Amino acid sequence: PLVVVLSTICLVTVGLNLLVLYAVRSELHTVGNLYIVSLSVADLIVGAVVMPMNILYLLMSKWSLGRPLCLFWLSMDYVASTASIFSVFILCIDRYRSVQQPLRRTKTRASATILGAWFLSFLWVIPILGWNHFMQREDKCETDFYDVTWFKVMTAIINFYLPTLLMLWFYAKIYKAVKRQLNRERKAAKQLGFIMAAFILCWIPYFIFFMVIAFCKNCCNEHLHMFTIWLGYINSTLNPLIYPLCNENFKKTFKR
């Protein structure tokens, strides 16, 4: 019942993101829409590499995937999540730059910034790779730290709440700059705000959920845990679904 729904979700996500990539390569193709490629590839990663592993983990309780396989799937999960987060962050920082800095280039620095974001995302693999090797179960497919709670909550902090406040600060700065300067820019701000809202609304449930469950006595809510997992994955799917409806140009692009 659920497995077919999640498989349909995966196929829709991969297909729509592949069509987005095909549209990007076919034509756009400028300073505008410069980092939505990063969101598209992040969604490709999360869908393609996590969703099959997630449905395998979910169809029954505790199928073991293999120790290196579980490590690598967890690594892709976390690095793709943080890469998408900071990809939105650097997209917003570049929009702020494009709107304010030329008062006081973009193409050549965009590649450097995206590779830097990818590198800072992929340095997250090292904590997972080494926990007892240098920094002193098999049926389970967590292979992470549960006993230490403050490290987990600190990781949650640095991966969600600091980017959230950076998003809010940048949104306020953009709004104030637009107000003091004065329809196309209004539409761009509206689509960015809708992406931010979908992001926050449909990724906050699991984040706060395991923030509370990082330590509790009523932590036995695994069904709602997996519900929030597939909810967040749906949000990752629908970010490139909220995106196309706002822009008419790329709308006509994928109409082809």
Swiss-Prot record:
GO terms for cellular component: cytosol; dendrite; plasma membrane; synapse. Signal peptide: none annotated. This is Histamine H1 receptor. The lineage of its organism: Eukaryota, Metazoa, Chordata, Craniata, Vertebrata. The gene is HRH1. It comes from Homo sapiens. The keyword 4Fe-4S does not apply. It comes from the Eukaryota. The modification Phosphothreonine is found at residues 106, 108. Changing residue 159 to A: Loss of activation by histamine. Residues 23-34, 94-110, 245-256 are cytoplasmic. GO terms for biological process: cellular response to histamine; chemical synaptic transmission; G protein-coupled receptor signaling pathway; G protein-coupled receptor signaling pathway, coupled to cyclic nucleotide second messenger; inflammatory response; memory; phospholipase C-activating G protein-coupled receptor signaling pathway; positive regulation of vasoconstriction.
